[PDB]
Write a protein that binds this ligand. Structure first.
Ligand code: ATP
Ligand code: ADP
Ligand code: MG
Ligand code: MG
Lengths: 109, 117, 528, 37, 43, 570
């Protein structure tokens, strides 16, 4: 099985609170390093996702604030396949691409 | 018209920053999830998220029906339901390894004492 | 059924009358929720101290009570993990759900296990603090006191030690005695945020709780720790703090008619704490095979170590970490005084690699302090003056550490060896340099396919000088050199940096491609 | 000396662009020539 | 000087506390004696 | 629908809502100095002696999101705060226990119960009627079924053997409502501001009852996350006050704590638009009368609820003042959803009253003769101040340290709860420096990166470092002379002197002593002024110009004016 070894590498993170989320499901074509902007307290990660079923390229940004959120964000590499649920953040009004916060995510590498 | 849209956006940004920095409800903090033949295959087969992505809608509906969960006309809803079902451990709560006594190796073929008489 | 009647209610104690075989600390039930413990008793009556309080239950003279005939035993439930409980087991804040099935019931005054059940302390306990892990080591089964003034960082040090067990399979128990509920909720939030909530319990007795609850909270915590130890688990217990426990015991004894002794404390205040802290240690395979590590906290007044309770507690534990107010005012965090701090276990509590790495650093630190306080004239002895003024300042820069920052044991050892080999001479008080080095080493030893094996080798076996030199020269130094030259501009012209890193292999071509692939800033071979 | 918040943002951007230039300079300092055949 | 002050203050405080409790323990002799009598009789 | 939206508002509500009216800059340019000053005083920003600066201050206050929110809500139908978990009043009972006094002493009376419909509970109140006057006795110890001991809450004159007493088997209760604002009472609810004793209209609540369904409810709290703005340069820059925490005011006698307390009351009522509760424990009669009169004069009396346990009252009555104040604050937060700033003075007297009550009831004294339940009582008082979904309860408590002995058990008990300590110095006051707050000794837990910016932390750290270094160098200057310093040391000393004198500020309440009008300085203005001074920009100005000003520009303007006059004079 090609996907047999991918099961042992699953990493799942979730929140027990339920908000309105944007669901992304696909491969990570390109992911950059992390930037610290709000007084070196947050983490900014630009993501390029090739979705599933349409194979279109979308660009998003991810924000991390806690230690566990940064740990979950650090698991995303190139060619990683993700089922990510992201809460929209109101800072996208000053951004070219939307800024999101990880609510639930499942990561396989 | 009293409050401009730009100032409302700034207030939203500040309130979101405050809600992220200081959290009152502990359900808002990310949690890491802990991770005869035919019944075993039914109850133990594990699929990857990419594998379920490569699936068709009918196959995912059939898999949801086989495990007795809801069937949806959407691809993403089916994938999400299957992932939540398989990743959520019914008995394990990531707090049971702390309750498991350590295993010390045991004799499988031990001598038995004489019968008391 | 009820067999006792309340006769008097004074001094916050209840005077039950009835004919029964009372025993010390026997639970007496006044309702299904409220119960107390027997302190003193005779052939016709007893004096009881309540542990609970109920709004709908109005205890009064003539009320009925049942003497259950059993000693005070705390029950163990599965949902203790990731929860705040009180001394009777009720879950004040919970993350999971209970099953109403008691895994065990532990007597609170369980006598300490005898000498033949013990073992030597030889396995490190990671506290996440470089100075503590390298100069003041803590072993699994040790009793280390954190003693100091108010607002100096004792609780921060204990929480840091309790955060470093994120991936070590060591249970955490935090007993709060007269603490504020705001701070306890904040600690719960920090536990959840740092991924150790599923591994930790918090026993709480607030400052306005019943005096019996505040007195018996540490014993209940120790009973839970003993339950966990009996199945071969390493338990780390923090008591915050034992001065409040001494005050609670004094109040309970004074209100019960016991005569005051030195400083108004009862006459047996030393026994109360010794019989409590002697329940920790390392036990043999036939008696559980686990360990219990205790980190009691004590508060001094303006540096007065010679206080009654602080000197009682120093003469019980295996060393002390003393937090200085002068260093805290000067801005040093964590403000730990190395001169007044001891660890009687010593290198016996360190791993072989850490013992090799941190050998003879306290002497160099004391020499540096002696030179700094007594430089006197501008006349200089030799280059050894610069040697000391360099290595001591490098060590002092290594001392500083952010709050809630966990620095791994092997990362600390590697930093010590780099310092001792002169690979930190270029430092001129640029915190980002050490931050980069620490992050690179941490990621390399945690995630790299070959770095993970290197870390396992460092943890298990004791390597010699030649093998360590090969390890440093052929993997660690190229990675450090590339990741330093790409972030610090002044390192291009720093004469010491070229003097030390000239012959190191250049690895920019591969680390570039690793960065462009989204890899972390320490992977050098691949992810395991 | 002390700085304003805007000056802190400017300093952050200056450091990021400095690191980019350091990236280029690290390749430049490796005095290399294309392999010939 | 710190050493001497600590020693002296400890001594004085302990003496004061014991002397204060002396009155309380004197005033409750009769209850103790009656309890001793009734325990001696007992069953 | 103006008629409909105004139909949901009472006339007093409209009067209050006239404050949150938006004024355009075109209109604002047309006002005069007198109208601008009236607007500033109404909005709590303090007097201004310049036109454009006053307009800028008014615009900055108006452009704030909270002010705009209030102004926008003021033109809408009234929305009522729905109280979740309100305070429930006491239940209606009858006098069910009857008895009489059988033993008398100083402050302690024994009661023998004759006719009881139910067994007596701890802490219940027995009422006695002597010469038409009502005396309350709180129960302490229940010796047996029909014999209890009690201590007086008030005055013990008129009690004697055989005085009949009756009880409802309930603890003491007081009448609480919104009408408590503007009135002065004692812990048990007796009127203290007029001889005819006009009653307070409200419901009877028991301050000793917390009304919690379970103990777990006491752990549903929100840890402090916000900083209260006071308008005082030193407090804002160096010692941020938590919102929902506790700040201690420490010092000897005459350092100036009460003036700071009055200034904070005024600033919270006017600028922050809230409700203030004052709880005087062991309050001197002269000081209480003076503070009441100046509260009436300065205009913050109608929004303040005063509780006074006077110095001459029995220790039992003095002990209950803090509990009554806490109960009033809990009512004003839970029942009305208003943030409350509770003031306590003096905590040392609360501890002393507790010790007195413990000693009177024949309990074994603890170390230094204090009560065995010292820390327990301090926790009981301080644990009901917190921050919940309904609002914030901020506490600012003044303490007296005897002989500057910070190791006294009362002080050690108090520091266990303080979230920010402000320590006053008698030497600094004697130098004429006011508010005479010691910046080096004091510290706040809220001066971190979790709550403040990088700029604020850097400015605070640099200020403290400069002040400590100049304090060190002043001794060298005094001994060896100002010439012995190096070139950098002279600049450091001058910057430190100007920094120290810039921290002084005139208060709007302290106009009685020096006659100088007060000022209100925002956090940004103080930060900018300190940033200007730290760089050495104003190093060409004599130090005497930096004393008792509001903002950095006032010194520059005064120096320029003096230089112009000097140039014209010759
Ligand atoms: N490494 C650190 N870096 C920065 N701040 C720190 C560090 N460690 C502790 N602090 C801060 O120091 C203060 C005191 O810490 P802490 O509450 O742990 O001390 P304590 O000795 O337990 O005090 P208390 O007397 O209040 O019980 C807190 O504001 C905390 O955030
Ligand atoms: N900001 C101030 N400006 C001028 N005088 C002050 C100020 N603060 C306090 N004082 C002085 O303090 C005296 C009153 O002391 P008080 O405020 O009662 O101090 P405490 O309550 O700490 O004993 C007044 O005579 C007054 O002159
Ligand atoms: Mg602490
Ligand atoms: Mg005063």
């Amino acid at each position: 099985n090609i996907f047999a070894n991918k099961i042992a590498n699953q990493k799942a993170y979730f929140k027990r609170d339920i908000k309105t989320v944007h669901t992304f499901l696909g491969r990570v074509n390109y992911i950059q390093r992390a930037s610290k902007f709000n007084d070196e307290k947050r983490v900014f990660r630009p993501l390029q996702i090739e979705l599933s079923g349409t194979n279109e390229i979308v660009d998003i940004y991810l924000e991390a604030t806690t230690y566990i959120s940064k740990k979950a964000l650090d698991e995303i590499r190139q060619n990683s396949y993700i089922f990510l649920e992201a809460k929209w953040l109101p800072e996208s009004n000053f951004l070219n691409n939307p800024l999101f916060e990880i609510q639930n995510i499942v990561i396989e590498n | 018209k009293i409050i401009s849209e730009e100032k409302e956006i700034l207030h939203l940004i500040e309130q979101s920053k405050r809600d992220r920095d200081f959290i009152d409800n502990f359900s808002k903090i990310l949690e890491e999830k802990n991770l005869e033949e035919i019944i075993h295959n039914l109850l133990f087969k594990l699929y990857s998220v990419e594998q379920l992505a490569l699936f068709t809608i009918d196959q995912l509906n059939a898999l949801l029906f086989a495990r007795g969960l809801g069937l949806e006309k959407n691809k993403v809803r089916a994938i999400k339901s299957l992932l939540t079902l398989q990743t959520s451990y019914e008995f394990m709560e990531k707090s049971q390894a702390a309750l498991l006594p350590k295993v010390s190796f045991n004799p499988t073929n031990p001598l038995k004492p004489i019968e008391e008489k | 059924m009820k067999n006792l009647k309340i006769t008097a209610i004074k001094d916050n104690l209840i005077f039950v009358e009835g004919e029964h075989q009372f025993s010390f600390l026997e639970i007496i039930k006044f309702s299904d929720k409220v119960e107390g413990v027997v302190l003193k008793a005779n052939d016709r009556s007893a004096i009881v101290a309540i542990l609970n309080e109920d709004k709908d239950l109005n205890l009064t003279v003539g009320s009925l009570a049942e003497a259950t005939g059993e000693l005070y035993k705390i029950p163990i439930y599965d949902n203790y993990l990731g929860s705040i409980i009180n001394v009777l087991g009720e879950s004040l804040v919970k993350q999971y759900e209970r099953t109403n099935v008691a895994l065990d019931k532990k007597y609170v005054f369980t006598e300490a296990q005898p000498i033949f059940t013990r073992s030597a302390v030889n396995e490190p306990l990671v506290t996440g603090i470089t100075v503590v892990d390298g100069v003041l080591p803590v072993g699994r089964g040790q009793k280390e006191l954190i003693i100091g003034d108010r607002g100096t960082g004792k609780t921060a040090i204990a929480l840091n030690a309790m955060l470093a067990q994120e991936n070590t399979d060591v249970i955490n128990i935090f007993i709060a005695i007269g603490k504020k509920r705001d701070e306890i909720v904040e600690i719960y939030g920090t536990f959840k945020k740092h991924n150790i909530l599923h591994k930790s319990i918090i026993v709480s007795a607030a400052s306005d709780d019943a005096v019996a609850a505040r007195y018996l909270a540490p014993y209940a915590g120790m009973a839970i720790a003993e339950f966990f130890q009996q199945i071969g688990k390493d338990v780390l217990v923090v008591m915050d703090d034992l001065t409040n426990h001494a005050d609670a015991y004094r109040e309970l004894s004074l209100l019960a008619g016991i005569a005051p002794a030195r400083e108004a404390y009862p006459g047996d205040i030393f026994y109360v704490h010794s019989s409590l802290l002697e329940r920790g240690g390392k036990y043999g395979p036939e008696f559980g095979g686990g360990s219990i590590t205790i980190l009691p906290i004590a508060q001094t007044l303006a540096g007065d170590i010679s206080g009654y309770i602080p000197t009682n507690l120093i003469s019980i534990t295996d060393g002390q970490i003393y937090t200085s107010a002068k260093l805290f005012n000067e801005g040093t965090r964590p403000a730990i005084d190395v001169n007044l701090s001891v660890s009687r276990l010593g290198s016996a509590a360190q791993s072989k690699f850490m013992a090799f790495a941190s050998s003879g650093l306290k002497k160099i630190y004391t020499e540096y302090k002696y030179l700094k306080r007594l430089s006197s004239f501008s006349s200089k002895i030799s280059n050894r003056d610069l040697e000391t003024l360099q290595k001591g300042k490098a060590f002092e820069s290594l001392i500083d550490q952010a709050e809630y920052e966990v620095i791994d044991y092997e990362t600390s050892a590697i930093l010590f060896l780099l310092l001792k080999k002169g690979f930190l001479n270029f430092y001129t008080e640029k915190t980002e340099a050490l931050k980069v080095i620490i992050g690179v080493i941490k990621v390399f030893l945690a995630k790299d396919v070959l770095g993970r094996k290197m870390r396992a080798i460092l943890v298990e076996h004791g390597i010699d000088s030649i093998v360590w030199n090969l390890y440093l020269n052929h993997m660690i130094l190229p990675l450090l050199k590339y990741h330093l030259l790409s972030e610090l501009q002044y390192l291009a012209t720093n004469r010491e940096f070229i003097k030390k890193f000239k012959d190191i292999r250049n690895d920019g071509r591969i680390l570039l491609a690793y960065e462009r692939k989204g890899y972390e800033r320490g992977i050098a071979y691949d992810y395991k | 000396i002390v700085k304003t918040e805007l000056e802190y943002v400017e300093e952050d951007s200056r450091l990021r662009k400095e690191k980019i230039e350091l990236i280029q300079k690290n390749y430049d300092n490796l005095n290399a020539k294309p392999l010939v055949g | 000087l710190i050493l001497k002050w600590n020693r002296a203050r400890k001594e004085e405080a302990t003496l004061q506390s014991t002397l204060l409790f002396s009155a309380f323990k004197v005033k409750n002799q009769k209850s103790t004696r009656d309890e001793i009598l009734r325990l001696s009789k007992g069953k | 629908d103006p008629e409909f939206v105004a139909s949901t508002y009472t006339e007093e509500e409209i009067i209050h809502n006239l404050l949150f009216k938006l004024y355009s800059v075109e209109q604002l340019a047309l006002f005069t100095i007198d109208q601008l000053n009236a607007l500033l005083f109404a909005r709590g920003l303090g007097l201004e002696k310049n036109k454009v600066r006053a307009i800028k201050s008014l615009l900055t206050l108006q452009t704030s999101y909270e002010f705009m929110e209030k102004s926008q809500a003021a033109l809408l139908p009234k929305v009522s705060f729905n109280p979740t978990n309100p305070l429930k009043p006491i239940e209606e009972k009858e006098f069910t226990i009857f008895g009489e006094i059988v033993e008398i002493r100083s402050q302690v009376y024994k009661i023998r119960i004759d006719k009881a419909e139910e067994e007596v509970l701890p802490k219940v109140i027995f009422y006695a009627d002597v010469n038409g006057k009502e005396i309350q006795l709180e129960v302490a110890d229940i010796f047996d079924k029909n014999l209890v001991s009690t201590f007086v809450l008030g005055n013990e004159t008129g009690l004697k053997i055989g005085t009949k007493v009756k009880s409802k088997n309930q603890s003491y209760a007081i009448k609480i409502s919104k009408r408590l604002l503007g009135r002065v009472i004692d812990p048990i609810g007796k009127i203290l501001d007029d001889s005819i004793a006009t009653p307070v209209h409200g419901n009877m609540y028991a301050p000793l009852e917390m009304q919690h369904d379970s103990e777990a409810t006491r752990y549903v709290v929100s840890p402090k996350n916000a900083i209260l703005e006071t308008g005082i340069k030193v407090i804002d820059v160096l010692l941020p006050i938590p919102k929902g925490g506790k700040t201690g005011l420490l010092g000897g006698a005459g350092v100036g704590k009460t003036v700071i307390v009055q200034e904070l009351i005024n600033a919270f009522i006017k600028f922050h638009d809230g409700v203030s509760v004052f709880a005087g424990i062991g309050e001197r009669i002269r000081e209480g009368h003076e503070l009441w009169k100046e509260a009436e004069a300065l205009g913050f009396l109608n929004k303040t609820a005063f509780i006074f346990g006077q110095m001459n009252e029995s220790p039992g009555l003095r002990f209950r003042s803090g509990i009554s104040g806490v109960k009033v604050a809990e009512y004003f937060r839970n029942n009305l959803g208003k943030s409350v700033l509770l003031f306590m003075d003096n905590i040392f007297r609360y501890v002393q009253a507790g010790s007195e009550i413990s000693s009177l009831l024949e309990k074994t004294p603890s170390a230094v003769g204090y009560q065995p339940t010292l820390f327990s009582e301090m926790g009981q008082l301080q644990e009901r101040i917190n921050s919940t979904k309904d609002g914030d309860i901020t506490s600012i408590q003044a303490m007296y340290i005897p002989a500057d002995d910070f190791t006294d058990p009362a002080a050690v008990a108090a520091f266990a709860h303080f979230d920010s300590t402000i320590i006053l110095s008698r030497q600094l006051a004697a130098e004429g420096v006011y508010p005479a707050i010691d910046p080096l000794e004091s510290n706040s837990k809220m001066l971190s990166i979790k709550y403040t910016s990088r700029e604020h932390l850097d400015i605070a750290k640099k200020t403290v470092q400069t002040l400590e270094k100049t304090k060190t160098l002043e001794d060298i200057i005094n001994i060896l002379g100002f010439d012995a310093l190096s070139e950098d040391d002279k600049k450091v000393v001058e910057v430190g002197r100007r920094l120290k004198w810039f921290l002084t500020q005139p208060f709007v309440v302290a106009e009685k002593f020096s006659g100088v009008p007060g000022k209100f300085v925002r956090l940004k203005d103080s930060l900018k002024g300190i940033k200007t001074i730290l760089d050495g920009d104003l190093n060409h100005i004599p130090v005497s110009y930096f004393s008792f000003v509001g903002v950095v520009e006032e010194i520059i303007e005064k120096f320029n004016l003096d230089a112009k006059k000097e140039a014209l004079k010759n």
